[PDB]
Design a protein around this ligand. Structure first.
Ligand SMILES: [K+]
Ligand SMILES: [K+]
Ligand SMILES: [K+]
Ligand SMILES: [K+]
Ligand SMILES: [K+]
Ligand SMILES: [K+]
Ligand SMILES: [K+]
Ligand SMILES: [K+]
Ligand SMILES: [K+]
Ligand SMILES: [K+]
Ligand SMILES: [K+]
Ligand SMILES: [K+]
Ligand SMILES: [K+]
Ligand SMILES: [K+]
Ligand SMILES: [K+]
Ligand SMILES: [K+]
Ligand SMILES: [K+]
Ligand SMILES: [K+]
Ligand SMILES: [K+]
Ligand SMILES: [K+]
Ligand SMILES: [K+]
Ligand SMILES: [K+]
Ligand SMILES: [Mg+2]
Ligand SMILES: [Mg+2]
Ligand SMILES: [Mg+2]
Ligand SMILES: [Mg+2]
Ligand SMILES: [Mg+2]
Ligand SMILES: [Mg+2]
Ligand SMILES: [Mg+2]
Ligand SMILES: [Mg+2]
Ligand SMILES: [Mg+2]
Ligand SMILES: [Mg+2]
Ligand SMILES: [Mg+2]
Ligand SMILES: [Mg+2]
Ligand SMILES: [Mg+2]
Ligand SMILES: [Mg+2]
Ligand SMILES: [Mg+2]
Ligand SMILES: [Mg+2]
Ligand SMILES: [Mg+2]
Ligand SMILES: [Mg+2]
Ligand SMILES: [Mg+2]
Ligand SMILES: [Mg+2]
Ligand SMILES: [Mg+2]
Ligand SMILES: [Mg+2]
Ligand SMILES: [Mg+2]
Ligand SMILES: [Mg+2]
Ligand SMILES: [Mg+2]
Ligand SMILES: [Mg+2]
Ligand SMILES: [Mg+2]
Ligand SMILES: [Mg+2]
Ligand SMILES: [Mg+2]
Ligand SMILES: [Mg+2]
Ligand SMILES: [Mg+2]
Ligand SMILES: [Mg+2]
Ligand SMILES: [Mg+2]
Ligand SMILES: [Mg+2]
Ligand SMILES: [Mg+2]
Ligand SMILES: [Mg+2]
Ligand SMILES: [Mg+2]
Ligand SMILES: [Mg+2]
Ligand SMILES: [Mg+2]
Ligand SMILES: [Mg+2]
Ligand SMILES: [Mg+2]
Ligand SMILES: [Mg+2]
Lengths: 156, 129, 79, 123, 205
RNA sequence: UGAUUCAUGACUGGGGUGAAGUCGUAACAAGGUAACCGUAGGGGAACCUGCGGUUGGAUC
RNA sequence: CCUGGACGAAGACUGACGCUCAGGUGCGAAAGCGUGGGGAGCAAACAGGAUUAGAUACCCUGGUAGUCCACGCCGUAAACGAUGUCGACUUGGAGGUUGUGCCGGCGUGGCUUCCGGAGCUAACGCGUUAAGUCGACCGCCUGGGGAGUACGGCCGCA
RNA sequence: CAGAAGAAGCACCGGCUAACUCCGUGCCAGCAGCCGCGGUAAUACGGAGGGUGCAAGCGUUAAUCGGAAUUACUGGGCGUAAAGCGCACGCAGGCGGUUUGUUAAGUCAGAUGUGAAAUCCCCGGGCUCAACCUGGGAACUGCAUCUGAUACUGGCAAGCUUGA
RNA sequence: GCUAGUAGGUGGGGUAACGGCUCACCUAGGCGACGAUCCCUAGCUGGUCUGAGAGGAUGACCAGCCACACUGGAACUGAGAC
């Protein structure tokens, strides 16, 4: 049901009296390929435990995306920290034209055709947050019609 | 000094929506009224009224849907420091057609969809989404 | 009709000749801002009627000297 | 920068200098060796690296690396140099082309032969 | 200009059967199909995302026998043509004459059907065509030449074609040894283990 | 008779890089006289001292 | 004694007369320079006494420019809020200072200190005196070192 | 007609980056675009076996654009990262509250002329296919002229009082 | 900052033709921070390469235009050439 993807594993370190203590971090995303997506970030002493913590957090933090037949509704911009991303709907057969971190998010969410570009910092943790922030704020003609007090047909 | 009353109008809307204000008030002008008319017909604001004679005062009643501002973004395009005019075949589309562009044509101020149907270009006043 | 430019007299110190500045208003090719550009033409002014400041009215003709190829039609506004 | 400021002074592109100026935008250049010797690299490397001083047909006098194990080069040898910096060697911006002009190919080389001017063995 | 080496190492690298043999035996009776070739072939490859895109492109190439320069040109045309680029690319590979001849049953494999095309034994609407990459149009008639109707491999190839699923966009007459290309195969008529969207994304890297 | 540009010149000015020899220990902690800025004078060297200024000073 | 600006309260008057500003011009701490005065205290330089391995210092005893005045020059400072000017808009709290209205109590202006909300920010923090939301115009940046140096120009007695 | 008969190489395999082992060497010899590798158990040097990528080519070098939103018009910054002139006044320049009328310069619409052919793009046609050749369109985003539109910007005239 | 045939005017001459094209005389102008003058580099275009585009780079082959013909200078002939 849920597609899981491991985006990045990093080794971090803190210093103590006896020397350095290493640990690992894991960044993952989960999604149902139909408009739901979440990301999790886990820390542990061993890689497998870090990944399992991340998968566990991701499943509890999914948001909803209003997709339009495997693509976006309109161009969107997302921002988080140094990361600025841009995404655009594309025609069928285009595929996912996106960088590695944006690709994992877009794919587990069910986006099949999209043109994307990451500006600024490409740190994966912040690119994922910016991507999901762009998808979560995307509007559909339904909600645009509702808030404006108009029918969908007068919108399109 | 004040050099763009239209940008001041849009900013008052933008800032009032962020402050959850029920209405915003500002000195009036015929161009401001013409823009208010388009905002109302598209359902972005609720109503407007001009009050006063020698110093008219325009008041815009803002709307909120499910506790959220209806105007998600409002942005000046043409501005005194840089005017923007578009021909009919190059009128912009806001949010893939889900938003509007307020265009000043020789037949008056209207949306980008209305200007396309009349086969006219003009000055791109602002985007509303 | 006849093509015709209109500008302002910036010099009248020549015998039967004047310098006229024509202002154009064009969009900058890169930055899109509308800017003012100027061209100064040497114009034939028989009768020596124009003074510095007048808004005149000129047309293109045959060469009359090394630099003159325009001639005064009328005065639109006097200074 | 405002558009008014850009109308007066437009954006300026930074001109980049070549890392191989003695080639003068030619793919190779021929020179005459004026000195053949060894030199030791920067920290943290240690070796006796084989280089040569070579006066080019355009008058430039530069240093060129001699790659591969063993060479036949001496003073007055006529060689062909190409672009290519040697990272750990101070100011060596060019490589000698093995197997061109007076530079012989490397002996007994079996892999990456075309990079060292070695003909195919008859096996 | 043609791969001329062992045929099963290809299918073993791609981890699936590429129909590179006739089919008289089972691909597991001739090779260790589920094992990649070589000394380290038993290892478990940790394919990067680029590696997964690359292997999908090499699979489709190795099925039809196209080299990279020719394949890249198919992609450029597929992207130029209107419609879904990934499906356009499969329709162009299925239009090749050597492929059409094989799908009709005249060759046991695509390599054999290519030798039949190359050796001047095939006609299109009544003209000899010996270009393996010739594009077959709708309603075109592909047929075996008379001097080649007596070859023993063409009937051995016709008796293996019914052992496989019959293509529904063609129409073969095993008797007169000629078929008609009625229409371009839809995406549904083609295999589902080919993930052509990976190829389209690979050529945007 | 000028201007400009290229090459070259005993000697000389500082700069970069390498390497680490000699002399000290100026800065980083209140770095053992808080540091730094402008200016002036002095000193083998880092610098020191006067005058005004800053906190991008620890303690209290 | 001569003289500039700011603010408030009621009115009257003009009628867009406005905002910003390359080049230009003026002002511009301290030190420093020129001429003429002045010189208590302080004190670069300098001298001696100490401290120290040394001590061209820190400490002590002295002490000259200078610090002061008149006129002229210089034109630089961590000249800092390290935050250009002008205008509009957007929850609050506690103070300082200076007006003014009303009945200590209630308002209403100007300038100012600290905290903090949304928002913004890499973070620290900023937060109606914005680093928030916008408009107008200007100045400036484009890896570190070489270097704010060389050469040339302009300015300066230096 | 005859017979598989005459016809496969080049780079790479530590990470970016598709592809791993042994032996030799022992900060040497050497590699290197960068991170870096080499000190006696080297997937990084050299040979070998195996593998990967291209293929009558494959590598290297040179050079341009890209990635570089790293000169940012589209599309960046300036409290502390590089960056607000020490502070002002002010000419040129840029910008300009509100109402009516007029003008039609900017702007917008339409027409006409021109924008050579080739090239690019679309639908076709012809060489067995393709490259290539070719018919017809579109495009040439411009300029000029004419006729209209008048909201906005500009000009001219008259005001207004909220900026000054 | 530059310019004295320099900027304009009148008259004569000259050219296939307008013209400081040339000469005499008169006027004292003309160009320039919307970059004159001076210095360095360069044939221009249709196009070509790159780029999602805006741009950036470029101008070989093919076609249009210009310039040159050992170096400097000159005219003659001719519808047309320096
Ligand atoms: K080393
Ligand atoms: K010299
Ligand atoms: K010190
Ligand atoms: K300190
Ligand atoms: K000092
Ligand atoms: K000494
Ligand atoms: K100034
Ligand atoms: K004293
Ligand atoms: K001591
Ligand atoms: K004294
Ligand atoms: K000074
Ligand atoms: K301060
Ligand atoms: K008060
Ligand atoms: K009070
Ligand atoms: K300024
Ligand atoms: K002096
Ligand atoms: K050994
Ligand atoms: K910009
Ligand atoms: K002349
Ligand atoms: K004359
Ligand atoms: K061009
Ligand atoms: K010549
Ligand atoms: Mg970056
Ligand atoms: Mg004349
Ligand atoms: Mg080929
Ligand atoms: Mg110390
Ligand atoms: Mg100290
Ligand atoms: Mg200084
Ligand atoms: Mg001293
Ligand atoms: Mg002292
Ligand atoms: Mg002083
Ligand atoms: Mg002195
Ligand atoms: Mg003095
Ligand atoms: Mg004195
Ligand atoms: Mg003392
Ligand atoms: Mg300064
Ligand atoms: Mg101060
Ligand atoms: Mg202060
Ligand atoms: Mg400053
Ligand atoms: Mg605060
Ligand atoms: Mg900031
Ligand atoms: Mg200097
Ligand atoms: Mg001076
Ligand atoms: Mg790999
Ligand atoms: Mg070993
Ligand atoms: Mg090796
Ligand atoms: Mg760029
Ligand atoms: Mg930046
Ligand atoms: Mg600093
Ligand atoms: Mg700084
Ligand atoms: Mg300041
Ligand atoms: Mg001012
Ligand atoms: Mg106005
Ligand atoms: Mg008009
Ligand atoms: Mg054409
Ligand atoms: Mg055909
Ligand atoms: Mg054509
Ligand atoms: Mg008007
Ligand atoms: Mg008007
Ligand atoms: Mg002439
Ligand atoms: Mg004459
Ligand atoms: Mg030339
Ligand atoms: Mg780009
Ligand atoms: Mg003649």
């Amino acid at each position: 049901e849920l597609q899981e993807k491991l985006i990045a594993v990093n080794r971090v370190s803190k210093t103590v009296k006896g020397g350095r203590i290493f640990s690992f971090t894991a960044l993952t995303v989960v999604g149902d390929g139909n408009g739901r997506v979440g990301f999790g970030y886990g820390k542990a002493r061993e890689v497998p435990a870090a990944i399992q913590k991340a998968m566990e957090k991701a499943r509890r933090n999914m948001i909803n995306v209003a997709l339009n037949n495997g693509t976006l509704q309109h161009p969107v911009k997302g921002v988080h920290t140094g990361s600025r991303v841009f995404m655009q709907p594309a025609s069928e057969g285009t595929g996912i034209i996106a960088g590695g971190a944006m690709r994992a998010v877009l794919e587990v969410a069910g986006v099949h055709n999209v043109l994307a570009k990451a500006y600024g910092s490409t740190n994966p943790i912040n690119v994922v947050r910016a991507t999901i922030d762009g998808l979560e704020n995307m509007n559909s003609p339904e909600m645009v019609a509702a808030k404006r007090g108009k029918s969908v047909e007068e919108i399109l | 000094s004040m050099q763009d009353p239209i940008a001041d109008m849009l900013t008052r809307i933008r800032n009032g929506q962020a402050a959850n204000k029920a209405a915003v008030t500002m000195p009036s002008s015929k161009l401001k009224v013409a823009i208010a008319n388009v905002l109302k017909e598209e359902g972005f604001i609720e109503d407007f009224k001009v009050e006063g004679d020698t110093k008219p005062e325009l008041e815009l009643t803002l709307k909120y849907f499910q506790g959220k501002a209806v105007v998600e973004s409002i942005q000046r395009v043409s501005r005194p420091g840089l005017r923007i005019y578009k021909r009919k075949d190059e009128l912009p589309k806001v949010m893939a057609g889900l938003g509007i562009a307020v265009v000043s044509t020789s037949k008056g101020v209207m949306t980008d969809r209305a200007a396309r149907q009349a086969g006219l270009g003009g000055e791109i006043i602002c985007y509303v989404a | 009709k006849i093509r015709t430019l209109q500008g302002r007299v910036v010099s009248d110190k020549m015998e039967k000749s004047i310098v006229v500045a024509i202002e154009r208003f064009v969009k900058h090719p890169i930055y899109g801002k509308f800017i003012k550009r100027t061209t100064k033409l040497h114009v034939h002014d028989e009768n020596n009627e124009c003074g510095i400041g007048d808004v005149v009215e000129i047309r293109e003709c045959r060469p009359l000297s090394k630099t003159k190829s325009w001639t005064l039609v009328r005065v639109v506004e006097k200074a | 920068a405002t558009v008014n400021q850009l109308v007066r002074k437009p954006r300026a592109r930074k001109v980049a200098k070549s890392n191989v100026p003695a080639l003068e935008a030619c793919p190779q250049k021929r020179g005459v060796c004026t000195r053949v010797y060894t030199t030791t690299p920067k920290k943290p490397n240690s070796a006796l690296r084989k280089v040569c001083r070579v006066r080019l047909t355009n008058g430039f006098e530069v240093t060129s690396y001699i790659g591969g194990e063993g060479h036949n080069l001496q003073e007055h040898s006529v060689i062909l140099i190409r672009g290519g910096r040697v990272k750990d060697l101070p100011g060596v911006r060019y490589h000698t082309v093995r197997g061109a002009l007076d530079c012989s190919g490397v002996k007994d080389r079996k892999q990456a032969r075309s990079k060292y001017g070695v003909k195919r063995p008859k096996a | 200009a043609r791969y001329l080496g062992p045929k099963l190492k290809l299918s073993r690298r791609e981890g699936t059967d590429l129909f590179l043999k006739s089919g008289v035996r089972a691909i597991d009776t001739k090779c260790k199909i589920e094992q990649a070739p070589g000394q380290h072939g038993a290892r478990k490859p940790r394919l990067s995302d680029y590696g997964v895109q690359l292997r999908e492109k090499q699979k489709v190439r190795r099925i039809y026998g196209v080299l990279e320069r020719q394949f890249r040109n198919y992609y450029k045309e597929a992207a130029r043509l209107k419609g879904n680029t990934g499906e356009n690319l499969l329709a162009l590979l299925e239009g090749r004459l050597d492929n059409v001849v094989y799908r009709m049953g005249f060759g046991a494999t695509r390599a054999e059907a290519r030798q039949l095309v190359s050796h001047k034994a095939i006609m299109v609407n009544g003209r000899v065509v010996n270009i393996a990459s010739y594009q077959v149009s709708p309603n075109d008639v592909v047929s075996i030449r008379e001097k080649a109707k007596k070859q023993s491999r063409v009937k051995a190839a016709l008796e293996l074609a019914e052992q496989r699923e019959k293509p529904t966009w063609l129409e073969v007459d095993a008797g007169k040894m000629e078929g008609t290309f009625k229409r371009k195969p839809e995406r549904s008529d083609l295999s589902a283990d080919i993930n052509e969207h990976l190829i389209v994304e690979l050529y945007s890297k």
